[PDB]
């Protein structure tokens, strides 16, 4: 859908990407066994959910290496409508993963820059994400700044 | 809940009092009643794919029964991911207790209720971002440090 430098392109995730997306996401978190039919239903949900305003709530993107037609990186930006900032739109970048054979050559930065473009084009006033301390420097190279602390419960 | 308070989902008539409550957190600005009614309709209809009826947005208010005044508000947004076997992640957002009602246990009660809503829906974790000043409050609510929040502004 959109070409990137050095033989890559970016496009929305599709139903046929399950295996390649699973392989890429391993570097982040365990995906586990997912049935093709369930994934098809997830993609349908991600391709229909819209934000009250067309704004897609979910924007699951894959960067594909043209040399082998393999998914090299994936990331998502989710759009949230809030009450604050006069019903503002806030973007949330999530599930960033560069396939282990494709790290250290600029793809992470290219992916984040693309997600940021998507969010600001929908009208988000800010885009946020959470990362471990060891990744802060990567996000600073992408134009982000420290905004707070991520807390969790399980 | 303690004597004299109750919790319920936010409603269209809550605009004026929710605007006042959220000012302790950030700038709300002016919102028209027509637009707020449309936002509450969006929040009362948007469901997450999974029957299990999962609302994407779960805006709650704690109300002082003496005068039916909103004393606190918070929301938990439910996200469907691919990782963790098409897992659900809860995102707590926009937590605010009016100044006059702070330090009486209402913030912890609100968080506890949002956490219950998220785990009852099947979330594998619930996360939130906060400024350093709020960390000890969230630790008293059972949360632990998970990472760093980063942001980029338009
Ligand atoms: C919102 C989240 O989802 S956070 C979770 C992110 N994901 C993960 O940690 C999974 C495992 N790691 C990865 O998938 C990748 O290595 C990523 C996403 C962290 C980074 O992507 P990469 O493609 O490897 O990095 P990329 O080559 O674009 O790096 C761009 C710049 O950041 C730097 N950089 C990359 N990672 C780091 C790091 N951890 N610490 C410091 N600097 C870094 C690079 O040196 C480069 O600097 P330069 O421009 O001066 O040469
Ligand atoms: C995801 C987010 O939206 S983060 C934004 C959070 N909101 C804001 O910062 C706006 C301004 N502040 C507020 O709205 C409120 O003061 C809140 C939400 C931070 C806290 O709510 P409150 O009702 O004041 O706190 P509550 O009385 O429930 O306190 C619960 C526990 O935490 C403790 N606590 C509260 N604030 C603090 C603090 N600043 N430092 C240390 N401990 C604290 C209390 O003493 C209490 O302890 P206990 O359970 O041992 O008795």
From Swiss-Prot, chain A:
GO function term, MF aspect, one: glucosamine 6-phosphate N-acetyltransferase activity
Residue ranges constituting the N-acetyltransferase domain according to the UniProt record: 29-154
Keyword Acetylation part of the UniProt annotation: yes
An individual GO BP term: UDP-N-acetylglucosamine biosynthetic process
Protein residues bound to D-glucosamine 6-phosphate: 29, 82-85, 94-96, 125-126, 130, 154
Catalysed reactions listed for this entry: D-glucosamine 6-phosphate + acetyl-CoA = N-acetyl-D-glucosamine 6-phosphate + CoA + H(+)
Xref: InterPro entries: Acyl_CoA_acyltransferase (IPR016181), GNAT_dom (IPR000182), GNPNAT1-like (IPR039143)
Additional remarks: Present with 2550 molecules/cell in log phase SD medium.
Quaternary structure (record): Homodimer.
Protein name, per record: Glucosamine 6-phosphate N-acetyltransferase
Species name: Saccharomyces cerevisiae (strain ATCC 204508 / S288c)
